[PDB]
Design a protein around this ligand. Sequence first.
Ligand code: 6QM
Ligand code: 6QM
Ligand code: MG
Lengths: 209, 209
Amino acid sequence: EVETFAFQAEIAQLMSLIINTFYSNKEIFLRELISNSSDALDKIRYESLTDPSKLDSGKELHINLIPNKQDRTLTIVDTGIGMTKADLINNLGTIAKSGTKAFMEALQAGADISMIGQFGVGFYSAYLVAEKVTVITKHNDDEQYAWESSAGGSFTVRTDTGEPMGRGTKVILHLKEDQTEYLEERRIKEIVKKHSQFIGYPITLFVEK
Amino acid sequence: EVETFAFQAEIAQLMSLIINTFYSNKEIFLRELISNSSDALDKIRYESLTDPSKLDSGKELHINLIPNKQDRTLTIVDTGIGMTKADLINNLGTIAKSGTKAFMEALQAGADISMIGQFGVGFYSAYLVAEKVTVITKHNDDEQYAWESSAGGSFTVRTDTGEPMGRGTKVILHLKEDQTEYLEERRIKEIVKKHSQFIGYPITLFVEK
Ligand SMILES: CCOc1ccc(-c2snnc2-c2cc(CC)c(O)cc2O)cc1
Ligand SMILES: CCOc1ccc(-c2snnc2-c2cc(CC)c(O)cc2O)cc1
Ligand SMILES: [Mg+2]
């Protein structure tokens, strides 16, 4: 029950650009993923203003950052709106075809990769630091699903039978071997303070034994 | 058939802060309104990816900037998703209560008014330059409505019987007497180039006789 899909040509090109372009300022991936979490949390907040039962699947609106040096993963968990299967398949609920075109045009007019989030496709900056990304998500309207991709042109979607998440999205970054600085507490804290210090939801950096 | 509503206390406080705080960099209102238009256009684009009939109310996705020196108005029109009556009443589809709290906390930790858009309430920066704002909107799911407010704690909502807009939102800024620089073509072009040069939709600056 694992379905495999091909990325649209434009998204595959975006991912190859992110993976192959020499670009040292890789830390911006975390700003972009926290930003997407903040957007998802705003969306469930806004739905709850008129239907409070939308928060029956969890009232606390927050983001957790969980490093795991044994597994070489950094995971970003939020309790936002989550995504339906259809959203996951449709480029993680982004307008990535048009976004990708508008990011490319910007790159030719002098922009740099750190501006990716202005084009709606900041999620793909995960591939600056990860060799594989796994996205586990639960929307009130749907079941819990796991999306996954090591790039190379395809992604998978399956029903997830991991731990139930209530509602929201978890992004597991399986980091490249030379990017393990992003598991160190001091480094994560430095990046959060530098780029995400005014995000309007609590961000909890877990520690490890 | 005009309904009058009171702003929530936090939003009235936000508007008073924007109106009364000395802050010279007023031009950021246009960046924030164009940004909101871009978000609205992305939302209708994303809905259309799975139901193309969503664009039966207009296929072109764009933003127009229309100055009118006779009426002393600058109007920003987009063909995005538009807002329902409920959205207009619920602070123009924003999470303005929580956004306002998180903007205030940021202001006390050194942020400035130009950062308002990071808190989901950039629309209210219109009141840096306008004594009254009128918002006309049409969502595929609803009728055409006009919201209006000269601040002072209340806003109005009525069914609009102006020109039909097909779909999207029009924000009419009735500018303060000392803010008419924002009707001059060279000034608008300078601001768009400075702050909005990579927005992924065409922005057309109308001229006047
Ligand atoms: C420009 C943003 O567009 C979007 C589109 C969708 C989302 C949504 S809806 N539910 N989860 C996410 C989400 C998605 C991602 C990206 C996998 C994530 O990292 C964290 C999340 O909570 C957020 C931003
Ligand atoms: C952080 C953004 O949250 C939002 C919330 C809602 C919107 C939406 S849905 N339809 N129109 C607008 C819109 C609303 C405004 C503001 C009146 C505007 O100026 C232009 C628009 O097209 C855009 C951003
Ligand atoms: Mg945004």
